Amino acid sequence: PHRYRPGTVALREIRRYQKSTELLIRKLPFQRLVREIAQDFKTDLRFQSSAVMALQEACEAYLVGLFEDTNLCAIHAKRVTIMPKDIQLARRIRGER
Amino acid sequence: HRYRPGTVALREIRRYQKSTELLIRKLPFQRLVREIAQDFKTDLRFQSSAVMALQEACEAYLVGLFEDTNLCAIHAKRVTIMPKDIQLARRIRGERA
Amino acid sequence: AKTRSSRAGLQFPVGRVHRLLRKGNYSERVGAGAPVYLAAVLEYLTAEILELAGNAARDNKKTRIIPRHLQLAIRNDEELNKLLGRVTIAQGGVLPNIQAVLLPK
Amino acid sequence: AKTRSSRAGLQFPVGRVHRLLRKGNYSERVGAGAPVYLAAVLEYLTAEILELAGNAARDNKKTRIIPRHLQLAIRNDEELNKLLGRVTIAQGGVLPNIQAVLLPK
Amino acid sequence: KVLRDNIQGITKPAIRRLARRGGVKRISGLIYEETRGVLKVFLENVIRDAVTYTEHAKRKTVTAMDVVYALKRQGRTLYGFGG
Amino acid sequence: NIQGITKPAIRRLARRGGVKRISGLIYEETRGVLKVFLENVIRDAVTYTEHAKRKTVTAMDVVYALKRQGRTLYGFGG
Amino acid sequence: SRKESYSIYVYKVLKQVHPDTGISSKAMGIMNSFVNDIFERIAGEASRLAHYNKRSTITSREIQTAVRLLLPGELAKHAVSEGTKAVTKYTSA
Amino acid sequence: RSRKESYSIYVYKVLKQVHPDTGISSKAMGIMNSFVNDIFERIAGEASRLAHYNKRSTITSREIQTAVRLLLPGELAKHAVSEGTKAVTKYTSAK
DNA sequence: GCGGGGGACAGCGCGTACGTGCGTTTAAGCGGTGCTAGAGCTGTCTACGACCAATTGAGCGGCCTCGGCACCGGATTCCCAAACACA
DNA sequence: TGTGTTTGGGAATCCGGTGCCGAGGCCGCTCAATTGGTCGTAGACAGCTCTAGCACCGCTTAAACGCACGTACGCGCTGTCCCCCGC
């Protein structure tokens, strides 16, 4: 029939998403996650919709930057697959805890 | 006789992490700071404590940079630090574009 | 009565910047030339970014500037990138960039 | 005449903190309890660091605290380490730390 | 209703999409959980501050301005939501 | 004049960082980075001095120049 | 309640730069945020300089020093040039 | 002869409270002075921001408490708030 | 400056885990309705903090002392790197 | 041919003497904190409006999930060659 080689569609998806701007996390599950996290600090908290939007924007930006640094670390290790140790190294160097 | 290679490296690592004094010769660093400052304003004078502060800050910065470089080198499954490790650490830290 | 911005040849509001400086508790007193200088600097930076963003928008056959264009303008200019380095832009995306290792031989 | 610090049961100078708040252009007005609360917080933080640093000094058979002991106290306490993370301490040194990979088999 | 175990709403394809936006070509299988950890931590750090800023103002509602202010307090300023 | 930062000095700085083995090309890189850092600090320090009508760079100017980059330094009158 | 923005000034500047290009509302929000952020950076640095020189007024000199501290090389050069030009013109008239 | 301001004597009093048979070198006293000034400025600046944010003109103990919660890590913030509230309680209870 | 040994880098194999694709399932997204908690604004009046003149003692500069710490030498100990024992 | 234990021997550590200089204490002074009192207003409180956040429902379809299948990348192993390390 027809089947593309491994990694061709990966590059195609890289070009499509690095070219677009739309948010890559589903909005409703993220809203639920935010609410359930904030439930641990004060009960019965309401949120402006734009507050959750700002939180999602910030989280996606943070994760994209983190994935860039993870990919750099992985390439530095002569690998192509990113691994959790790459994430741990990137956050360790970045100064996060 | 002869020490096993790398053993004296470890001994000096312990020796220098145990201590606290400055690891750069004071007078070459003072000459370098004065030389650098000559490009910004001419005929400047430095209090000794000013040069001491600059030396302490620079040494701390370089030690932190070498910590990150060591992390990068271990990540690539090496023991020797290479200029690529410094560049990767500085790039992740956000200093190098 | 001619406004301070007109007398200084600017488009940013000198009087408003002066008011914000006074009502911002930066110091007890504010000189006359401080708001003029600050307005000139702000106008210059805004003009630079709008230049670059308009160029980027025209590069995409777009006649309006959107946050994506601002992000491309900022991230492509190295001194602007240094200035706005710790800043994330909503709906901005990232620069198209693929490591040469990941590309096929 | 009893001092404000005495009336609050503190050893840090409440009056001095109040003076610095007024003469620091933080706000137009300063409440009565603000210097007391701030002095209490500074005293508590100083007490924590002096606790940890005294312990570290006694760990080296030393009866005086030197910058090395303060540095070890800060870097060994995780919440202090988070607080003073971007801070470098003159004559402080670093924590003894060698990666487990570098040790010989 | 109680809100429980919503971290699984960050699905594997969403994490892959985020990695694609980051220029990543191959993703290990253990990445997805690690990411859900990292994200959960980031959120806890941001929300704790936003909630604090809301408590101080006596309000029962977290506004977008509190989130922006918490972010810039973490040195991670955000453009486009006021302020 | 950057050469005053000798090979053994950089070796010691790396040793304090926990580095066991150092390549031969590290030194010219390290010198470069350090020089850049110094220029970025000294520039600001000098700017504070020139603003203060002074001709002497004081340790306080250096402390504020370091705090500028988020490199807060304790122990010099800060 | 009244609201404060730099929308109209940014639009005027853009028309001065690219006379046939418009701008979204979202991009105007971002430009307003950027102008504010830079304003606070400069004003805070100038206030710092003033209080650490035991000096009580914010003059154009404080703004200029703050600009050198905040802006990168060529940007700081040109911004200082524009600020000096504006102060000279303002005081001449 | 200028006027110099420091916290040497108060830091020494706190040290005598904590570790009575323990002294502090002059370099360490300078570091502790720097730390105290740094923390004071951090807390005061955050409190000033909070006072401004709420379009508010006064810095009260509430702003200091909120700034302490914002800056210090969790357990440290909890103990710091306990100590500060205890101190203000004692200060206002007496007269 | 020199001898050398370990580590970096090259080449190969293999095996399983990750990418691609297909069909099924699920819940996200959109719209539409309704309710009410709470955000935002306004008027009052009151307690609380700024300002000022007078008092005074707490803190700061200056001197002086001695003990904690630095330094030196001598003895103790602690890894190490061969090195041969012996299976 | 290989696994394992032991010793001279440099290197870090402990201990005692000693001496020296800064930390801790004491005194005289002064200036900044404290007291008491006046006065203005910042904000705490009540109270009122209206919006925008929450809960729900139904429907469509796009995305997530499970699974089959194959290959290509990670990782282990071997070799060599050279370039940092120890002196």
Author numbering:
A (entry chain a): 38 to 134
B (entry chain e): 39 to 135
C (entry chain g), D (entry chain c): 14 to 118
E (entry chain b): 20 to 102
F (entry chain f): 25 to 102
G (entry chain h): 29 to 121
H (entry chain d): 28 to 122
What do the paper's sentences say?
In chromatin, linker histone H1 binds to nucleosomes, forming chromatosomes, and changes the transcription status. Here we report the cryo-electron microscopy (cryo-EM) structures of transcribing RNAPII-chromatosome complexes (forms I and II), in which RNAPII is paused at the entry linker DNA region of the chromatosome due to H1 binding. The nucleosome is composed of linker DNAs and the nucleosome core particle (NCP), which folds an approximately 150 base-pair DNA segment into a histone octamer, comprising the four core histones H2A, H2B, H3, and H4.
In the form II complex, the exit linker DNA is released from the DNA-binding cleft of RNAPII, and the chromatosome arrangement relative to the RNAPII is rotated around the entry DNA axis by approximately 65°, as compared to the form I complex. Considering the nucleosome rotation angle, RNAPII may have proceeded ahead by a few base pairs in the form II complex, as compared to the form I complex. Therefore, the form II complex may represent a snapshot structure of the RNAPII just after it escapes from the paused state in front of the chromatosome. Intriguingly, in the form II complex, the RNAPII clamp may directly contact the H1 globular domain because of the RNAPII progression, as compared to the form I complex. Further RNAPII progression into the nucleosomal DNA should require the peeling of the entry linker DNA from the H1 in the chromatosome. In the form II complex, the RNAPII progresses a few bases ahead by releasing the exit linker DNA from the RNAPII cleft, and directly clashes with the H1 bound to the nucleosome.
